[PDB]
């Protein structure tokens, strides 16, 4: 490979840990800014419901009740080049609990694919695809 694998693994962990911190902090305390963490064409499958486009995502997020997330598990992996040619991506998987205003606290699992956007300053990671589901969605 043109670049050492460990380099991709280290980069993936750093990008994921920092992004997760920003993501849930924003979700809970700056909801209106959350959609900016997504790519324009990004989609979200929320408990079996597909939401497409940054505009629809913004409306979806403002639609949802206030939240309080507690993240306890984060894992990530650099995505193989064959799946995303000429695009640096990282798979992130999260587990924790969340309490939406108007309902009891429940556990959830979320996974998304982050994509690296090079730019003037530092590299910016954004969600290209997202998936969220309550462990007890059926009830």
């Amino acid at each position: 490979a043109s670049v050492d694998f460990k380099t991709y693994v280290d980069q993936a962990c750093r990008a994921a840990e920092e992004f997760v911190n920003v993501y849930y902090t924003t979700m809970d305390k700056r909801r209106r800014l959350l959609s900016r963490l997504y790519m324009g064409t990004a989609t979200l499958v929320w408990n079996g419901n597909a939401v497409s486009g940054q505009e629809s995502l913004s409306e979806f997020f403002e639609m949802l009740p206030s939240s309080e997330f507690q993240i306890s598990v984060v894992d990530c992996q650099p995505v193989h080049d064959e799946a995303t040619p000429s695009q640096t991506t990282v798979l992130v998987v999260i587990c924790g609990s969340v309490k939406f205003e108007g309902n009891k606290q429940r556990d959830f699992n979320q996974n998304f694919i982050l994509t690296a956007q090079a730019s003037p300053s530092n590299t910016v990671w954004k969600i290209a695809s997202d998936c969220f589901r309550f462990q007890d969605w059926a009830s």
Binding site: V9, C13, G48, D75, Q77, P78, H80, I113, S129, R133
Partner: protein, 180 residues
């Protein structure tokens, strides 16, 4: 508050593709020898396991990878299985299983001509070892590329294993007589 729904496949063709893949994958996974999965993973595939931080999951503890808690770059690196040889060798060391495939809740969340990302939610029973008959719940996220046949070739696989809740156990094991 959008109503929570079951599996999301997007299209019928993808539903058929992914469900078939899952049936074949787990037929091998639950067989007693997972080497057949070598044909399902890319030479450069990645696989990692994570479990809750908060019936014991001791057998999954050693290989659990939680980067939010584990900070060491070297340990983080070693815990990520890389190459189909290491991925499948690791999987074949995990407890033998019996997954309830037909009850899987599957979400296909990403798709391009070169990528398919889908997460699988369900339960599996351990068939032997110290936790024989225990019911575990899991969420597994796969990223696959087209395979030279019409199938899928896994490049990324993240498995999250936890204990099934009281409600999940009750629902999974129930078999009441029929009533009006």
């Amino acid at each position: 508050a959008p109503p929570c729904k079951g599996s999301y496949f997007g299209t019928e063709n993808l539903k058929s593709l992914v469900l078939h893949f899952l049936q074949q994958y787990y037929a091998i996974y639950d067989s007693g020898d997972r080497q057949g999965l070598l044909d399902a993973y890319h030479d450069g595939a990645c696989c990692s396991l994570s479990i809750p931080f908060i019936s014991s999951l001791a057998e999954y503890f050693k290989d659990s990878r939680n980067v939010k808690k584990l900070k060491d770059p070297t340990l983080r690196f070693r815990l990520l299985k890389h190459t189909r040889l290491n991925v499948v060798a690791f999987l074949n060391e995990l407890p033998k299983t019996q997954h309830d495939v037909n009850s899987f809740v599957v979400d296909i969340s990403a798709q391009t001509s070169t990528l398919l990302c889908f997460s699988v939610n369900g339960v599996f029973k351990e068939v032997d070892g110290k936790s024989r008959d225990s019911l575990r719940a899991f969420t597994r996220t796969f990223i696959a590329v087209p395979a030279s046949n019409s199938g899928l070739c896994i490049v990324n696989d993240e498995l999250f294993v936890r204990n099934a809740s009281s409600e999940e156990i009750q629902r999974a094991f129930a078999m009441p007589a029929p009533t009006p």
